[PDB]
Amino acid sequence: TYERTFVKKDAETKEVLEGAGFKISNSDGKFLKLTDKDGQSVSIGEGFIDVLANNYRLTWVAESDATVFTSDKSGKFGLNGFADNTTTYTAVETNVPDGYDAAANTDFKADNSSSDILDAP
Ligand SMILES: [Yb+3]
Ligand SMILES: [Yb+3]
Ligand SMILES: [Yb+3]
Ligand SMILES: [Yb+3]
C-alpha cells in the first residue's frame, strides 16, 4: 500500500494553516470515505490519518457522504492505505479558513510523497 501527505500554507507568508478541509475525488467523480472494518462511519480529526494502524477501510462514495480531511496545527493532513499508486486523484478544498480563498484543486497520486498546498489571503 501507499500514502500521500499535504501541507497547507499561506501563499504569501508560507506559514502553515490549521483547519482547511479537503475531500478526495477519483476519475469516476466519487469521493473517499473512511470506515472501520465493520463498514461503519468513523469520526476522524485533523492531521494525517493512519488507516493501517487503526484498521480502517477506504471506500468511494457520493460527495455528500465523503470524509473531510483537515490540516492540523502544523498544516499537515493526508493518509496511508491506498491500494494504487498509478491512479490520479484530486484534493478538493471544501472548507476554507476565514481570511483565505480556496486553493486550486490538486491532482496527485499516492506516491508516498508530500507536497504543499497554497491558499491566497
Ligand atoms: Yb484531538
Ligand atoms: Yb480574492
Ligand atoms: Yb485537475
Ligand atoms: Yb513547503
Numbering used by the authors: 177 to 297
The paper states:
As the first reported host of “non-pathogenic-derived” pili, Lactobacillus rhamnosus GG is a gut-adapted commensal lactic acid bacterium (LAB) and one of many clinically investigated probiotic strains for human use in the prevention and treatment of certain gastric ailments. Our findings show that the GG-SpaA structure has certain features in common with other pathogen-derived pilin-proteins, such as the Ig-like CnaB-type folds and the presence of internal isopeptide bonds6940.
As an alternative, GG-SpaA protein was fragmented by limited proteolysis as had been done previously for other backbone pilins. This produced a 15 kDa-sized fragment that can be crystallized in two different forms. The structure of the 15 kDa fragment was solved by the single anomalous dispersion method (SAD) using an ytterbium (Yb) derivative of the orthorhombic crystal form. Intriguingly, six metal ions are associated with the C-domain when the structure was solved using orthorhombic crystals. Metal ions are primarily coordinated by aspartates, but glutamate, lysine, and water from asymmetric and symmetric molecules also seem to participate. In the lanthanide derivative obtained by co-crystallization for SAD phasing, these metal ion-binding sites are mostly occupied by ytterbium ions.
